[PDB]
Amino acid sequence: SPNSPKDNTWIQAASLTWLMDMSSLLYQLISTRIPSFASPNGLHMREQTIDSNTGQIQIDNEHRLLRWDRRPPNDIFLNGFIPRVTNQNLSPVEDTHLLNYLRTNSPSIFVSTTRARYNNLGLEITPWTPHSANNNIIYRYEIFAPGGIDINASFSRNPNEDEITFPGGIRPEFIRSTYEYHNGEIVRIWINPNFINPSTLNDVSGPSNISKVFWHENHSEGNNMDSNQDFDMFAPNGEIPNNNLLNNNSLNVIQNSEYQIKNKKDRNIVVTLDSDYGGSPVESYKNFGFENQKWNIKYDSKKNAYKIYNRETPTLLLSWNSNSSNGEQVIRGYTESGSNNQYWTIEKNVNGFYKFRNLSDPSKILDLKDGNTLNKTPLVVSSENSSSSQEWLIEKTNYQTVKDGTYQVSSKLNENKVIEQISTNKVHIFSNSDKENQVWNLIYNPILKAYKIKSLKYPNYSLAWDSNNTRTIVAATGDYNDQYWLIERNEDNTYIIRNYENRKIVLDLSNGSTTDGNGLLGFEFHGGINQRWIIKPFSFNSIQDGIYQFMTVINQDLIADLTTNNYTIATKTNNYSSNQKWTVTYNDKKRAYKIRNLQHAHLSLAWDSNHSDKIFGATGDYDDQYWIPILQTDGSFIFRNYKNPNKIFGTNGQPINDIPLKAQDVTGQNNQKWYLRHLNSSNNFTGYFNISSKKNFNKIITMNSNKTQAVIFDNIGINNQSWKLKYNDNKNAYQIHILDNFLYFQGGHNIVATMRNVTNDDLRSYWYVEYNFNKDGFIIRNAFDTSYVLDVFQGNFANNTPIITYQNYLNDNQLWNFIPSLG
């Protein structure tokens, strides 16, 4: 699409992850319902939400966002902000109708946030605040996310000027913290370990003498709530009360928790306790996430300093023995002695790194010997340097990195090469084709802080390391600790999948080879490309149950029709008859859909697998009658057959009237793709509209003075240009009327009348309103004779040119927008 956003960024945060590679289409669907005058420059996307020297999310005042929400952390930190609409079959009528959302708070794919506010000295101001904020339990979420739409910069409708809106919502890793309010007062500051930058968790600020807590799932005090979800972010439900300073910046301490300490000179190396006995040296070692490489940092108020306890051996503290003969400068682990030489002050510098200096001698700074990053080189104490070997990152440990559910796991080398389970015990890399044995159930174990990766087809088997024999990756029974995996998120959004019991061992695509059938290894961690994995949400019930038509992508006027010739299903001109409608129903056991004809319910769309490539209405129940809908980047679907997911139903070559559907190998071409009309849905027009021409947005359907005919005419804001759309649910069509005057069909080639006295069943007064994806506009097609559509006569846009009905060519003078008006 032309003039759309240059890249993904505006929607990279989406909770609806499948949405992220549909930038072009989403922008089109959002735009069609936005009149040129309402957004003269088109919508503005937040700039600079990501860096361009790292790609990382920018965390500063200017991009700090807030969301008021009544839902607690046990929900929000687990799920993120999921929109009210999550349907993969998106419609431009309501689901993506931004202005309706903004004006009505109607259900959509949108989730709103409000900018944090600061004065010209950079101190935080009272933000946009819901009117109910001092009543009962509400939360104030802190967000740093890629993209988002800048509403104020987008629109001129008089309004929260700080509203930033996210299509497809916001994933939980972009939520750093939240304030818990009980009746106006702040009671708690929650911090999310899983935030995208786990080394900025101690930059969270709030009022003094209010406790900060690191959240985990099912936190005992973590779902405090009252007895829709966007109520308190809706512009008319809040405002900016004033420009007061907020009570903040009241710690600047390291919160008591589990951390890793990483050197600035080499971030791959961490502070690690060598052994579990008194006087064991503390060394740098390559990070493999061992317990002895983790420390509990504990603050002392009175001394303004910290003790640092090893996690593997908690009775041992990171110590410098200032009472040694030899006067050693080395660091060791000793038991609690009472001395200040096991206390450290922790100061953050200009660039946001930490220096450790010993409390007993503050001139002594925590450093690596001679500035070496080599494994096992002792941690020492030394005098102040300009050197980066005495600068450290204090990183919050974080384990629950992905939500429980179904995923496809593929290699960074090639994201269409997925981990596939063949037979039961065997796993290998293979090209994706969206099958059950290519989908894995990841379930977190709260005790182990690690994941079981379970076969979807064979739940008894999980991904395991064959540690005692082949050292290969296999699938096996049992529930042993070495069948659990630590899933660590990298900066490039890939993951390391690390064995819980043998932490040197990670999932490794053998020799970095992406040839079909290549094996996986448990191999020593190096972090190279063949050890990095993409973990992508996969859902088998992508679409909702309902009554549907299948429109071909190439010609949306052609739909899948159960014909009377034998039982063959073919593409035919749409009439909205029963045999052209299908009930689509998900099956749990098959993880696939049955597509039963609405006229002939005993017949379901089926492939003649045994015999031929025929698509037809077949009786009974069988594997070849089940289909897996796979969303395409252009909003259409492809339907893989359960029996052979390499087969889909489409047409040979170009779809034309009465050519049979055929089962064929997936090819990605347009003749295999279908747009879904969900007849049964709630994406219907209600209220009053100016019906404007795609050719000229200021030219709109107008009832003439005599009230006899529809004409085209400049939008002059009159009663005769504001049409009520009255939806009839039985007919899937609209009456379009001004008072008792109805848009009324008078025959093909003829001027469209406006008629009084129309009966409820008079199909001449009924119109289908059909979105066309390729031309980006709506067809308005008569219900009495479905061959004819509203058409600006001769494509002449002079004032008073009649509207006629004519065959559909998808000409610009046959395409329409619906702009909300007043009644």
**3-class DSSP string for 397-438:** CCCCCCCCEEEEEEECCEEEEEEEEECCCEEEEEECCCCHHH
Q: Are 163 and 127 in contact (CB under 8 A)?
A: no
Domain containing 283 — which CATH number? 2.80.10.50
250, 270: one domain: no
600, 487: one domain: no
Q: Are 395 and 430 in contact (CB under 8 A)?
A: no
From 516, 538, 560, the end of a domain falls on 538
Q: DSSP class of residue 184?
A: T
- Which tokens sit at 710? 């529809």
Q: Of the candidates 183, 186, 193, which has an alpha carbon nearest to the alpha carbon of residue 133?
A: 183
Q: What share of the chain is helix, strand, coil (3-state, %, to 5)?
A: 15, 40, 50
Q: DSSP class of residue 43?
A: P
| Residues linked to residue 345 through DSSP beta bridges, in sequence order | 357
From 397, 432, 460, the end of a domain falls on 397
630, 691: one domain: no
45, 98: one domain: yes
From 499, 517, 538, the end of a domain falls on 538
Which single residue is written with the structure tokens 């502070």?
Answer: 271
318, 346: one domain: yes
| Residues linked to residue 475 through DSSP beta bridges, in sequence order | 463
Distance CA 411, CA 403 (A): 20
* Backbone angles phi and psi of 745, in degrees to 5: -75, 135
Q: Where does 44-139 have alpha helices with state H?
A: 73-79, 98-104
133, 167: one domain: yes
Which single residue is written with the structure tokens 């046959």?
Answer: 814
| 190, 222, 311, 329 from 213: Cα distances, Å | 5, 10, 19, 36
605, 467: one domain: no
Distance CA 545, CA 513 (A): 41
Instruction: Let me know the angle formed at the C-alpha of 547 by 577 and 670, rounded to the nearest 5 degrees.
Output: 85
Q: Are 590 and 541 in contact (CB under 8 A)?
A: no
3-state secondary structure 664-693: EECCCCHHHCEEEEECCCCCCCCEEEEEEE
How many structural domains compose the chain? 5
Contacts within 8 Å (CB) and 24+ apart, 356-359: 356/392, 358/320, 358/322, 359/303, 359/305
Distance CA 184, CA 207 (A): 14
- Largest Cα–Cα distance of the chain, in whole Å? 109
746, 762: one domain: yes
- Which tokens sit at 344? 């450290």
Amino acid present at 394: I
Specify burial of residue 71 (Cβ count, 10 A radius: 0-12, 13-18, 19+): middle
Resolution in Å, one decimal place? 2.5
Give every CB contact of residue 155 below 8 A, 6+ residues apart in sequence.
38, 39, 43, 99, 102
Structure determination technique employed: X-ray
Q: Which domain holds residue 743?
A: 682-823
353, 483: one domain: no
Domain containing 182 — which CATH number? 3.90.210.10
199, 331: one domain: no
* Backbone angles phi and psi of 548, in degrees to 5: -135, 155
Strands 354-358 and 344-348: antiparallel
95, 214: one domain: yes
Exposure string over 295-330, b if 16+ CB within 10 A, otherwise e: bebeeeeeeebbbbbbbbbeebbbbbbbeeeeeebb
666, 638: one domain: yes
Q: Of the candidates 84, 74, 89, which has an alpha carbon nearest to the alpha carbon of residue 112?
A: 84
Distance CA 548, CA 59 (A): 45
